[PDB]
Write a protein that binds this ligand. Sequence first.
Ligand code: 3PE
Ligand code: 3PE
Ligand code: SF4
Ligand code: SF4
Ligand code: SF4
Lengths: 318, 144, 155, 188, 52, 178, 67, 257, 56, 115
Amino acid sequence: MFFINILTLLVPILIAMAFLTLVERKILGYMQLRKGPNIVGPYGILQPFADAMKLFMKEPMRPLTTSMSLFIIAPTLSLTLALSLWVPLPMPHPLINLNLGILFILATSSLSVYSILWSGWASNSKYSLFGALRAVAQTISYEVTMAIILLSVLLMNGSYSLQTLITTQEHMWLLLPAWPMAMMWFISTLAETNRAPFDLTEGESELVSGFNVEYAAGPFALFFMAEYTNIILMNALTTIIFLGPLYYINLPELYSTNFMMEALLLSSTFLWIRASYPRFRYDQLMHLLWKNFLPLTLALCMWHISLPIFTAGVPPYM
Amino acid sequence: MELVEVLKRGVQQVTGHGGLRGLLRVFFRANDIRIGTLVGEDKYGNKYYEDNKQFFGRHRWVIYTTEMNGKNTFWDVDGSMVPPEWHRWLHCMTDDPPTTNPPTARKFIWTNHKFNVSATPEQYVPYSTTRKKIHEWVPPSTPY
Amino acid sequence: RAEYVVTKLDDLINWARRSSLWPMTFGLACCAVEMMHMAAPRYDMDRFGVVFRASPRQADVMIVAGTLTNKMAPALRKVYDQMPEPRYVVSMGSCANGGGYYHYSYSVVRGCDRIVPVDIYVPGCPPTAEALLYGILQLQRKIKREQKLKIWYRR
Amino acid sequence: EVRSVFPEAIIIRPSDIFGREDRFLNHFANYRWFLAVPLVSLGFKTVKQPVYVADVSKGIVNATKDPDAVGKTFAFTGPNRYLLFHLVKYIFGMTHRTFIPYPLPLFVYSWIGKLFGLSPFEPWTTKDKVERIHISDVMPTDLPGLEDLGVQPTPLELKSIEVLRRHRTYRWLSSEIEETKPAKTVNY
Amino acid sequence: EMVRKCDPHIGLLHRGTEKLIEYKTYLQALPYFDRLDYVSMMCNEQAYSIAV
Amino acid sequence: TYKYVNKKEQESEVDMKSATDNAARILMWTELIRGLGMTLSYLFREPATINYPFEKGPLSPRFRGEHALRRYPSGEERCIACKLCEAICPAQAITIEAEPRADGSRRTTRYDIDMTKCIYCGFCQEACPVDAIVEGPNFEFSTETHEELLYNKEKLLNNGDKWEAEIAANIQADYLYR
Amino acid sequence: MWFEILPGLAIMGVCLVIPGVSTAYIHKFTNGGKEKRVARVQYQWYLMERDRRISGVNRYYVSKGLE
Amino acid sequence: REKMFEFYERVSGARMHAAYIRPGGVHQDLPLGLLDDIYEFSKNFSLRIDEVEEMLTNNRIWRNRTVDIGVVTAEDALNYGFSGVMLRGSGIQWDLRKTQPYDVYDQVEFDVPIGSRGDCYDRYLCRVEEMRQSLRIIEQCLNKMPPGEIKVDDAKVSPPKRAEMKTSMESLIHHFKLYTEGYQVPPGATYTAIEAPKGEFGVYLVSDGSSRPYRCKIKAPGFAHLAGLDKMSKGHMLADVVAIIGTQDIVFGEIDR
Amino acid sequence: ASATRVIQKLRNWASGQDLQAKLQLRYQEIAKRTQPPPKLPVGPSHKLSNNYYCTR
Amino acid sequence: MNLYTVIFINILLSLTLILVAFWLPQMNLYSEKANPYECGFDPTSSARLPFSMKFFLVAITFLLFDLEIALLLPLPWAIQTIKTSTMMIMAFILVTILSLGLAYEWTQKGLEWTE
Ligand SMILES: CCCCCCCCCCCCCCCCCC(=O)OC[C@H](COP(=O)(O)OCCN)OC(=O)CCCCCCCCCCCCCCCCC
Ligand SMILES: CCCCCCCCCCCCCCCCCC(=O)OC[C@H](COP(=O)(O)OCCN)OC(=O)CCCCCCCCCCCCCCCCC
Ligand code: SF4
Ligand code: SF4
Ligand code: SF4
């Protein structure tokens, strides 16, 4: 009876992601005063199946100058991980509870890089070597902060188990104690998950389809299946770490129901961004995030250390 | 009110195209349900509704029909339809349709308008309409 | 029955290729301006499942707008020979069909069709953005009426 | 059944042809997907003079214009009557992957084709595609050929890059047929 | 990624509309000038319609 | 008259009220929020798109598209083989070899446009002293092949035997402007 | 108008409730109407492996009524 | 923008390549319902800039992505020959409508937006703001338009009315010569430098007594700006060299000719 | 027209100015179609006298 | 064991989805679409030459801080010590010397993209 839970855990995120490809084309459209898909289905509800079923019929390019082993393993490694990050993600009671259920996220969040490096390094091309290198200085930029913005929140929580925050948020959202953290977290949910106003890695206009250009349809979808699957995690965490919905344990479907209402906004909030702001030129993003967020991070990292000991607010290790 | 006047104004769209078999047809075939004043119904089935309250692109729309000149236009819908008296109207060149300002017939103009013959038979193939401009010789059937 | 299953698969295989066809970020001349006005909020490509992806490996159709010079020609078939091969082509303009102006100049190919094979031809000097849109709706049925699994059964 | 129907017909009898997207060099080239090449009798006892496509095509196109060839049979064979073991060693030296034989009789190597012949698609081998390779044995006797039709045929020594440059790996993707030890040709 | 020296090879769209005006009268060459700046059409016509 | 666009820098000894005004632009990056609300102002608008084959956008009577050879109200092909419509056609597209019709009249045996030529410029319908060659309001005549764009004379009379109800209205609407 | 977006959301919106509400009803079915009874420490594992040994091998049951 | 192609298609026939402005003045007059629509277009376009000029002229990103890019100095632009906007964006007050007004621009009041510190954002503002001062001129060109004629009143340079060449002879002859041969300009040579939005669009005609010309030659503003892509791309990297090209108003038709 | 007066205020606010008066979706204010026919003015020099081309 | 039941799946969900991408497209791989891209031309150099980065110094300061981040991570448990005055101080001492180490580099032009 466990496989029937994975089956109801991976189908309802690959079937959701698919309709984020749609929703990322309509919401962007109506801002551009242009209807998105309307035709293949009633209101574009049936476009990703075309897009999906279209891509698994075209020739997966095996380029002549490449490394065909790492060529095939990166999309295997991208769709694996970002799909595999939903395992401990606690809608109230998770599939797999973990003490260190968030270091599981950080570490596996970092292996989503090597799907972008091994790909563009394998694929012999200048416009993909860059996109590989464009992630190197990107991970170097935020990964100092996806820990401390994530530590100092979990410092006035106790264990790293994501399940504890449902009890930490039993009467209040952590957005109010830490909106500074939640700001920089939002942008650090936006560098990781390279989909962004600052994309810099799949740059259509500079590095055309960077880390992704020698890849044709078959392997190509496994990044879109992974990138738009990862957009929903790093908003699903904000709906756990900062925006705390209602537990009230006799209707646990109230958590999951309010968990919906906010995750779609934070998944629909990213959509205003791409339709609103350009990129950071790849030297600002590391001058914007070692200079402006990194000191401001260490400060609040220090403040939340002297927040409980100043007062009493010590998280318990249950 | 107000919040429901949309609903009360968006419900007759559904219940204004006959019933289900009509509403289900216009939707997947044209992808918009809107009530407008009919002014057309050409030969071979083109309805040509109208609504001046919508903006300048959507106040004149055609609703094609099936059973064109043996082609089954229920999904394969063209714009090389719309014959040469509503083209002047649907494309907003003029202000009145060909019912109250109809054209002049000239006893050569076609009656059965054909769509864009693309790759079927009944398409176009060039000539050299020139009368051959040279004449070689006539050998006789008389040896010597 | 087998043929009826294959006709519907071959009708169902094409629904994806014809709806979600991803044209390619081409350019080269005035004609390309109308493609932008076909990306515009009047005649939306995206409503037809049509999306600009600027790489051929991600592409499903080339739209050739503009004079295909002799210097650009290697870069046009180096690009057509970089897609997978359900690849389609569309020749916007009279500079790309025959070289309308510049048919007799020396640095202009007298047709996109000299070099890449083509499924459809859109005329017009600047064909109206509602005249490529008639073409990439016509290319969208020119391979509704392709029978690639039928002619496998009877073979 | 053509001569008895349409006499005064040209009949070209070409050898086994090679070219880009062929079924001859790109056949032996793709044996590398397995452990090695199972070719019969260690390749010997199979003499082959292949011919390039354009040599055949330029031969046809000139046969439809001469006053000659009003019934003359032909044979488009080409020079450099190679031997198969050295014909394949040339390929796998050109395609720098590797080469080790794995000889067999027709007892099994004609049955493996019946396993791959159970493919609804374009098969990789057949009962008979194995046997053309091994019937392939001939000496030119009297027939007219190319050189009395318009073409001066092309050796395999020269136009083999174009058809095997794909089958190589990076670290051999540029290797200059200056390199690679041309094959041993047998006259007999 | 920093740029030390660029070398544009503009010329991939040359057609030769300084040599075709030579064989076409002043009205028969007017619409060539729309093509030069295909974004600002009338401003070219407005130029060629003054030099004449 | 000239106007400075980026010239305001003058250190006015910025008071502490004008600092937070700047120090809350930063640390809440609010100038961008004024952009997010700006795109939120448009999803709630009516998207200007139009269902193309059912809603074909607006044109005007002078929209020049597919050529056609008009015809007098009593048959009689309106062309008279002048050749001042290829003497002006800048794309060098028209070849109209003619003869006496065997009525003694004067008409074409040949007429041609290579529509892969034909810049669609209007010089031929404004030069024609008889209003024979026009340039109709078609813009849906794309073709799967190159040969279907070599309109000679039979594809181009009967074309004019098609749109004449739709041409003359536009010609009647414009013979005062030309 | 913009209301054409809701299908893409409210079908995505009947797609992320399942892995939350299915994760509990699948636990209760397996765990005997109780919750999964997670064990972070070595004590909560001892109570299980005790309660596993006061019954049939499944541990979501017997209590008082015995002695 | 398509709302303005309908101000060609409603004037000429073609949306984009409208052969409308000929040596013989203009081919064809306006229809009765045109200026009444530019007014309904021009009153509102000024807000659409504000709906974009808001979105860009106050960000960080746009203001940290274009600023200090392309700092091509004043006296080097002229040595390079920009002459259009890549020099007034650096403070050189220069324009061929206040200095060399060719058509009716004498009696047209407007401002020439100038910017100091020319760095791909200061000329952006000079480019967003001459959209305004041109929108200011529509307010004039719509209000004052004398009820006169539309082409040159000289039937050997501008062909006659399509109905005047069916009563009268001479009008039919000149029609039969204008649209076969031409009108035999005299020999000479000129340089009409015009401020297209890119800049000094030039035409070096060289005439002979024939009806054909003898070597036109076209000055592409962009054939000089694209050569400035070498020094402006000094210190700047791949991600903002991509912005320099858009801050030259590049079109590869005028240049590649 | 498709506003229902509760989104006008949102739409006017989130942008920060009034745009129900300065919208870009043309309804009826435009010049219509089928204008009445004109009578263009003959220019100068059509005056039958004192118009020798040698002077002009 | 319960996680191996989750994650061997996702390899197969990826591995089963890739075999049905190479063996169900009907390909035609010959020569010129396999060769690399560079926007419609034959690439000049060999795609595998020294890149010569410019953020080389920041990559190391990260390489040092990923330790320092790791060296912070036991704070949620350290507060559950009985002292909570050396944990107080020594947490200030670690974060402070970092910012001192970060501010020195910030002034000596470390994170500035040599050019
Ligand atoms: C295409 C290439 C793919 C190869 C790379 C795949 C990467 C997979 C993602 C990486 C995983 C991140 C690191 C996981 C570490 C374990 C997380 C953890 O700390 O919790 C483990 C948990 C016990 O921890 P805890 O719960 O805190 O203890 C209290 C009891 N509740 O419970 C456990 O004890 C379970 C710990 C073991 C789980 C490890 C999963 C390994 C999966 C197999 C990987 C190899 C693939 C198989 C071979 C296929 C060929 C490629
Ligand atoms: C009571 C005593 C104790 C109290 C102790 C606490 C003291 C108060 C602490 C105050 C903290 C203030 C807030 C801290 C975060 C601010 C971060 C910041 O300063 O960003 C600055 C940065 C600009 O940096 P700079 O390079 O200098 O650019 C200007 C150059 N002229 O700005 C940027 O570049 C960022 C731009 C990125 C924009 C991306 C768009 C984001 C989209 C928003 C999503 C909206 C929803 C929000 C969701 C939140 C998550 C729940
Ligand atoms: S056909 Fe006309 S619009 Fe198209 S590129 Fe040529 S000149 Fe420009
Ligand atoms: S100008 Fe008119 S009448 Fe004369 S040949 Fe041309 S089309 Fe015929
Ligand atoms: S419209 Fe212009 S280019 Fe086309 S045929 Fe007529 S004169 Fe020639």
